[PDB]
Paper text:
Porins, which are beta-barrel proteins that traverse the bacterial outer membrane, facilitate the uptake of small polar nutrients and are the main entry pathway for many antibiotics. The crystal structures of OmpF and [name] show that they are both built of 16 amphipathic β-strands arranged into a barrel with a central pore. L3 folds into the channel and narrows the pore at about the half way point, forming a “constriction zone” or “eyelet” that governs the effective pore size. At the eyelet, there is a strong transverse electric field due to the presence of conserved basic amino acid residues on the barrel wall facing acidic residues on L3.
Numbering used by the authors:
A (entry chain F), B (entry chain D), C (entry chain E): 1 to 343
Write the structure that this text describes.
Amino acid sequence: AEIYNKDGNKLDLYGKVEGLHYFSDNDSKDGDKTYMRLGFKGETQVTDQLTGYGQWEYQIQGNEPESDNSSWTRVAFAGLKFQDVGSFDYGRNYGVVYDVTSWTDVLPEFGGDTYDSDNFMQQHGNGFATYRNTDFFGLVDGLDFAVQYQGKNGSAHGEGMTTNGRDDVFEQNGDGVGGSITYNYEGFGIGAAVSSSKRTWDQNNTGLIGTGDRAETYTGGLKYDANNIYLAAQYTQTYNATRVGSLGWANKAQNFEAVAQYQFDFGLRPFLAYLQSKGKNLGRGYDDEDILKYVDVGATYYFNKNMSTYVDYKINLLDDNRFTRDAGINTDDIVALGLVYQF
Amino acid sequence: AEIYNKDGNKLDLYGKVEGLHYFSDNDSKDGDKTYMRLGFKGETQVTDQLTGYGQWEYQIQGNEPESDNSSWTRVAFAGLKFQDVGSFDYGRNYGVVYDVTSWTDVLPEFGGDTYDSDNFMQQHGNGFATYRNTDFFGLVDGLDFAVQYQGKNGSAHGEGMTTNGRDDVFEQNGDGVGGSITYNYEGFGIGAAVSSSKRTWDQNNTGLIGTGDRAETYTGGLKYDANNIYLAAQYTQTYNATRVGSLGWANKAQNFEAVAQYQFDFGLRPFLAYLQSKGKNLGRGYDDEDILKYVDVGATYYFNKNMSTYVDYKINLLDDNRFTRDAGINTDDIVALGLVYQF
Amino acid sequence: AEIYNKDGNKLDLYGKVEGLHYFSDNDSKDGDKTYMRLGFKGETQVTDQLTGYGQWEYQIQGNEPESDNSSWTRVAFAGLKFQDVGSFDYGRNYGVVYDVTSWTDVLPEFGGDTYDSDNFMQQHGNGFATYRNTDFFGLVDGLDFAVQYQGKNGSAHGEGMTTNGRDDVFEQNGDGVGGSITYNYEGFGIGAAVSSSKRTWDQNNTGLIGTGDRAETYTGGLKYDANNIYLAAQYTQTYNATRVGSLGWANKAQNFEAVAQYQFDFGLRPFLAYLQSKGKNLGRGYDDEDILKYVDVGATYYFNKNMSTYVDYKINLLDDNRFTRDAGINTDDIVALGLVYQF
């Protein structure tokens, strides 16, 4: 909610308390999942044409006791924007792939999980330099695109090191470039997006599966957003990029998400989503196994734009087996019951 | 301080910097205790009758250096409220027992410590579902009550596990129900409150004292709040619920706190409190020993509703002995010097 | 940006997103250095004369992934202020030495690093009680001064312990007193400042170099601030107070910083700084070596008071040798590219 607007700078301070509770046969995915977010979108007029902006967002768990209380920055970036030319923003942001793949990330809790956080240029991530251009230089009303770069983010110990290095390997990444082209018109929306990132010495030489020189992503996506209806699906194919449990990555992964939502006038918005992450010849005695697969059906009710509540039912179609145990991939169902104030 | 109020949504963003310093013979309870809090109470009108709300509050220590900086969520919950029916809010909140026992938690720093944080349904805690009803459905102007449930909050390792599980044992809890009934009229206030919680496998089978199937609490409380005067005391009896050092819990504990405060017009508010936590036949070669006992006298001065400063003198009546050493219970005095801005 | 001003209390909620990236031959000092700050300055009128205030400031790194996210309180203090008498504020604040030495801390990223954080009374630090007096009781328009005390801040383990104790040794400190006297007139500014702190048992008896009973600081400083020009330099001599790598402290250190900045009307503000930290007979087979030495030249461009961007070039004049390796002192160059929104 915009709490400052004066002399051309304006500041919107925003957040939510999500009273969330998971139900499951799985004890590790069962209990209070209450959390809270807090951020600000900032903005300043420099000229007619040029406008500068900042943006921050933190997440703080509220399911944890007075000792440990895990919490983290989600996005943090600053940048400029010139009329009919483009915009450029450096910091922790969304990777360019998300531009397309996010169109299926519309469920209230689950969904949009064929990618992880800090998973190369696939979703959230540190040190994205991002050019974007809306309406193609003000000529084609609808055609937006982006050209993104991500600096190497290696380890803390000597070999393959950066100042911000992380000792976790899945969070690591190398130098990558990615692109996106989206077009919207009368609700309908085509979307292509291609990334390609270098990999760290640690990533290949921890002895994990699905190793190579480069992690690469291809992404097609279609959506329809009109007349109370949101239909959208997407194809994302990856080489050595999709995470596979703790075992490593998938040499090749064929990922597909599809969602159908209708908004009733009184407040209810039921959904019926479906996900899939088929991992092709992974090697090391597994071969063509499914990394993820579930149907997801529930409904959000909207009291208004400040209060909401929802049920979300993950129907996990994965069978229990060695691949789904060695990797440690939850094969059980989960049901989330959310009740959320925001501002 | 309410920084947003518009079209029925309103947001109050609040906090304080407490410049605090402990003096003591105990080196562990001596030094800078400076800390800071920040939260928001949120609120939105949905209808004439229905109003929805959120609330958050963090605490961040300011006595610590640039490396470690410990800090945590205190309360984080969302919920609805319907006129003359009640209110329901899920998240980290106060346990229902606090409804009564908080009437003695009126001292500036010490006091209100016959309960801990995440100590079952006794004070702060994760995953409270809480029904409340003010003025008994708008019929009896004075009679308020509550019906509270708390989900199991076990460990992180396999046996007795939840998604939010903590490896600390005192912070753990099981499924519990609790109630409260308070009545106020012309200042005077009766208050009863009863909780009863299941216990974790770890809690019984870490070999600590005062173990059982259930932790249970009984609480009576009386207060008088008028004519510059605040008199209030309370009785809280517990089975296997009160913490006793690091040794475990007290099979039975008889807890009593009493406070007397007077507010002078210029700003000074002296107090004279007294606490007691008599632990009855605890077992394991201790028997009837005192878990806590101190007289507490100081005074808060109020410059105004934004600035305040105070002295707080803990006169610890506990003697030094095996029970008060094995358990590791501070037998020494403490004096706090607070100087506090807030907003 | 002041988001609350009402009935004499006013609250300014402020922060920035600094899109920062280090370039260097050093891998440890190379990568995304994106971070964010958030604080509030608070203030309340009590009387004509008396005014009470609070202040907080947190820093949260945005170069790190969803698991670890390091962040800390920078300053947190409350205090009162009476017209023509003085002001007194207890909490994590700046040490009194900074009063003078901060006049060289005017560069956009580097500079002001002959002192560390929690480095006795030299810069940031916990538990400063600070008296200050502006314009010498309203008599001499220009002469400001301060009298500061810092409580012992030892370790967490038994010997030399405080409630806030830190297991790091360089962050530790003992009881210290410090002073400052500054005088400004027509831009020109003389400044003297002297501190003297007790040391912890751990500090001497971890076997590190430059050990003694007391860490002491002497500080002279001169500045000129007018006609788009900022010229300022400073001398800081220390006994057993300046940190020297991981090896310990410098028995004696002769520190000097000098800066020259010009503000062009359109927005550019180039600078040309120079630093030096000559460590005299340190002992343990090193003798007179340089602890730090670099020339620093770049330029900040100011779009306006909300957006800015800059380049900052550390030209490290230190040679690579045993002292600069055993201590582990970066001998390499660094170049910072900042782009910063704030509010």
